[PDB]
Amino acid sequence: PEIVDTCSLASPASVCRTKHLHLRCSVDFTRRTLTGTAALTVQSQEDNLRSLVLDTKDLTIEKVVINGQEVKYALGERQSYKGSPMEISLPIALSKNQEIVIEISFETSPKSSALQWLTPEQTSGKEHPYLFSQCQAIHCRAILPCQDTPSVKLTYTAEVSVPKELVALMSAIRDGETPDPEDPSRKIYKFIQKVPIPCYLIALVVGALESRQIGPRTLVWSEKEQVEKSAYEFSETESMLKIAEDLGGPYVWGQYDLLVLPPSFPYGGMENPCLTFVTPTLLAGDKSLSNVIAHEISHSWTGNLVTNKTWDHFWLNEGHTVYLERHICGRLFGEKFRHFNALGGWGELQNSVKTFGETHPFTKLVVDLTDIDPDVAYSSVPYEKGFALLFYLEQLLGGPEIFLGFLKAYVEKFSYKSITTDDWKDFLYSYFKDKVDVLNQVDWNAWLYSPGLPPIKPNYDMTLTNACIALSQRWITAKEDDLNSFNATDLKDLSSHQLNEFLAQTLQRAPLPLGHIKRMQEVYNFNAINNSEIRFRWLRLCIQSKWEDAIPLALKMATEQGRMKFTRPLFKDLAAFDKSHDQAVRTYQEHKASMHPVTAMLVGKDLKVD
Ligand SMILES: N[C@@H](Cc1ccc(OCc2ccccc2)cc1)CN(O)C(=O)CCCCC(=O)O
Ligand SMILES: [Yb+3]
Ligand SMILES: [Yb+3]
Ligand SMILES: [Yb+3]
Ligand SMILES: [Zn+2]
């Protein structure tokens, strides 16, 4: 029938569709508000459309103007994490394809779940405040009224007035800046996004930003203190974009800038169009965490051009993006490395399945988010079970070259559209019309709808994994007479990627005896490594193995940065260790007011506080 976006309270795409957004607002750090008007050009999809519903969350609505006049509107009661529905009465009944512009004057709440307002003390420079948004999945409604569903795509133009000493950037092409004629001291930045996008891709950052150009269509932005390191770390960006274009077809967004956010940014990155956001935890100093950049770049095709129609089909966004990500890395560092990463991904899937449990509905590839807060369901499953399905199909259908042909055709077929798993599978059969018999060998029901690990495991090259297995198994099975023989020389020919995999394998078998972990630090000096992925896994292993010396290190890492991938598991391990439990809870309570709103909520749920 009709696919329903169970995370939105707005009129569905089958009733009306927002085609354009014109945003005029001002950022006020003193009151922690964004105030302005949202001009929505809406297209009816039915005859006699007299009213529509938009999503909003903690928004103050002053008025709604249609054709210069103020119109009637009502706000329903709040529906938990979904916000409150906003019904707007149209002064004229619209018929199919007729359009109307609705201008809504609104003001965001300082507690907006889409935004994090940082005091100057929270920034690198200590002299200016900072602001950044994160709308995916459903927080756009916490910034402005909209049909907050990925099934709707719109273009947008924006004008943002900020303290003249600060810079504003958006998920759009920079369209110049000028003094705010209205009231000086403030400056106005203009933006234009001509490619239709789902509203979760609307992004804004305001702060003391500086840039460094690192490619013909790439500038790196961050506070002054991080510019140089960021410019160094992400130097391979243009080369990855060229590979991605070869894999997915032309890059259509124009600019591909990067913004290195403050430590509290909740994700590794966010594929905001024209301006990817990345965590500063990627600044390892050796470009080793660049797969995250390859990943956000890939989203420019899978996710931003071809978009999941509802969050129940989120794997379409992530599985294909991880698949592309790994091909980019394989083009740059070798097919063996692609397989090494693919296998590590299967290990992360094992971990997620174990955490949730093999019968947990959240381990299905296609999920049902009815009455489920997306932020709560988020996990590695759509990334890794989705990637595994695509990798398995690649092997079943003839190899990477053949499957990549499908990927490029898929992107072209559904560019600028929002689709479901059935659209994807129906096209796969259409593309592989000469291999229907092979496609019919796939246990689709299990892959798409069953919980747990996939029904079949792909084949993986083992070249780079073998040394990690050997070393991890030696530690897992080590006895007293083996401790003196481990030596720093064991790490001699291991890349940071392999050290991380070694730790991941060892962590799957934690706890290790306390004496064994103490010995590991003595011989490998992992406390000295600052690569966040490695430090994260090493501290988890230490805490899970009951080393009290590691408590302050883990509490430090969990609070000095806020990438949820790290912060949530660290607090969770600290809460599970009897020795650090009270300190973990007190540390969270002491820091929650200064944390990102979504991270604060999830860690509180994880710690069972309140
Ligand atoms: N799409 C963004 C990340 C992101 C941001 C926000 C959400 O929203 C939660 C959600 C969305 C859809 C379904 C269920 C839950 C989901 C993913 C880019 N991205 O996928 C990555 O950066 C992956 C790297 C992971 C590293 C990390 O620690 O974040
Ligand atoms: Yb007011
Ligand atoms: Yb106000
Ligand atoms: Yb022995
Ligand atoms: Zn992604």
The residues assigned a catalytic role are 296, 383
Range list of H helices, 186-313: 224-233, 237-248, 291-298
The residue whose CA is least distant from atom 17 of ligand 1 is: 136
Closest CA to 138 of 598, 592, 604, 603: 598
Cα distances from 485 to residues 169, 479, 492, 522, in angstroms, run 54, 11, 15, 12
CB under 8 Å to 40, separation ≥6 — which residues? 18, 20, 21, 54, 101, 102, 103, 104, 145, 146
User: How many whole angstroms from 69 Cα to the centroid of ligand 2?
Assistant: 20
Q: What are phi and psi of 495, to 5 degrees?
A: -75, 170
Q: Annotation-wise, does 564 bind a ligand?
A: yes
Contact 561, 535 (CB under 8 A): no
Q: 484: which 2 tokens?
A: 């003196």
Q: How far apart are alpha carbons 508 and 346 in whole angstroms?
A: 13
Nearest to 359 by CA among 436, 294, 275, 453: 453
Q: Three-state SS across 40-109?
A: EEEEECCCCEEEEEEEECCEEEEEEEECCEECCEEECCCCHHHCEEEEEEEEEEECCCCEEEEEEEEEEC
240 is an annotated ligand-binding site residue: no
DSSP 403-440: HHHHHHHHHHHHTTEEE-HHHHHHHHHHHTGGGHHHHT
How far from 8 is each of 137, 216, 310, 598, CA to CA, in Å?
Answer: 11, 39, 9, 18
CA–CA separation, 438 and 403 (whole Å):
13
Tell me which residue has its CA closest to atom 11 in ligand 1: 137
Which residues are in the CB-under-5-Å shell of ion ligand 3? 107
Three-state DSSP at 551 gives helix
For tokens 């796969």, the residue is: 428
310: left (phi over 0), alpha (psi -120 to 50) or beta: beta
Nearest CA to ligand 1 atom 22: 269
- Provide the 8-state DSSP code for 171: S
292 Cα nearest atom in ligand 1: 24
For ligand 1, say whether the CB of 159 is within 6 Å of any of its atoms.
no
* Ligand with an atom nearest the CA of residue 322: 5
Nearest atom of ligand 1 to the alpha carbon of 266: 29
Contact 260, 220 (CB under 8 A): yes
Calculate the alpha carbon distances from 107 to 25, 104, 173 in Å: 9, 10, 25
Give the C-alpha separation, 378 to 325, whole Å: 20
Neighbours of 177 (CB within 10 A): 15
Which residue bears the tokens 């002053």? 62
Amino acid, res. 78 = R
Contact between 539 and 529 (Cβ < 8 Å): no
Task: Compute the distance between CA of residue 268 and CA of residue 258 in angstroms, rounded to an integer.
Answer: 13
Which of 378, 379, 570 best tests ligand 1's pocket when mutated (most atoms within 8 Å of CB)?
A: 378
What is the C-alpha to C-alpha distance for residues 479 and 353, in angstroms, rounded to an integer?
A: 30
Angle at 98 between CA 93 and CA 99, to 5 degrees: 95
**C-beta separation of 563 from 576 below 8 A:** no
Among the listed residues 142, 113, 135, 150, the one whose alpha carbon sits nearest the alpha carbon of residue 55: 142
Nearest atom (ligand 1) to Cα of 271: 18
SS3 293: helix
* Pairing state between β 99-108 and 33-44: antiparallel
| Dihedral angle over CA of 157, 26, 111, 52, nearest 10 | -40
Task: Find where tokens 């980019």 sit.
Answer: 328
Q: Is residue 117 in contact with ligand 1, taking CB distance under 6 Å?
A: no
Write out the DSSP string of 580-592. THHHHHHHHHHHG
Cis peptide before 511 (omega within 30 of 0): yes
Distance 123 CA to ligand 2 centre (A): 29
Q: Please tell me the distance from the alpha carbon of residue 233 to that of residue 214, in angstroms, as a whole number.
A: 10
Strands 115-118 and 130-133: antiparallel
* Residue 137, ligand 1, Cβ within 6 A: yes
Q: Whose CA is nearest to atom 8 of ligand 1?
A: 137
Residue among 6, 116, 135, 136 to mutate when testing ligand 1 (max atoms within 8 A of CB): 136
Is the distance from the beta carbon of residue 295 to the nearest atom of ligand 1 less than 6 Å? yes
SS3 label, residue 189: strand
Name the experimental technique.
X-ray
Q: How far apart are CA 83 and CA 141, in angstroms?
A: 8
Yes or no: say if 146 and 54 are a contact pair by the CB < 8 Å rule. Answer: yes
Task: Please identify which residue in the block is written with the tokens 């401790």.
Answer: 483
Residue 283 to residue 189: CA distance in whole angstroms: 29
The neighbouring-strand residues paired with 106 are 36, 61
Ligand 1 atom 5: residue of nearest CA: 136
Distance CA 527, CA 535 (A): 7
Q: Does residue 57 have its Cβ closer than 6 Å to ligand 1?
A: no
Assess contact for 132 and 116: CB atoms under 8 A: yes
Q: How many helices (H) and strands (E) does the chain have?
A: 19, 22
- Residues 6 or more apart whose CB falls under 8 angstroms from that of 505 comprise 347, 468, 469, 472
Tokens at 576, concatenated:
């599970």
Q: What are phi and psi of 21, to 5 degrees?
A: -130, 130
Q: Say how many C-beta atoms besides its own lie within 10 A of residue 37's C-beta.
A: 18
Cα–Cα dist 112/597, whole Å: 8
CA of 471 to the centre of ligand 4 (A): 15
Residue 485 neighbours by CB distance under 10 Å: 10
Cβ atoms of residues 10 and 55 within 8 Å? yes
Amino acid at 262: P
C-beta atoms surrounding 50 within 10 Å:
11
Domains and CATH numbers, the chain: 15-207 (2.60.40.1730), 208-304 (3.30.2010.30), 305-461 (1.10.390.10), 462-610 (1.25.40.320)
Does ligand 1 have an atom closer than 6 angstroms to the CB of 566?
no
Cα 46 to Cα 434: distance, rounded to the nearest angstrom: 40
With 0-12 / 13-18 / 19 or more C-beta atoms within 10 angstroms meaning exposed / middle / buried, residue 45 is: middle
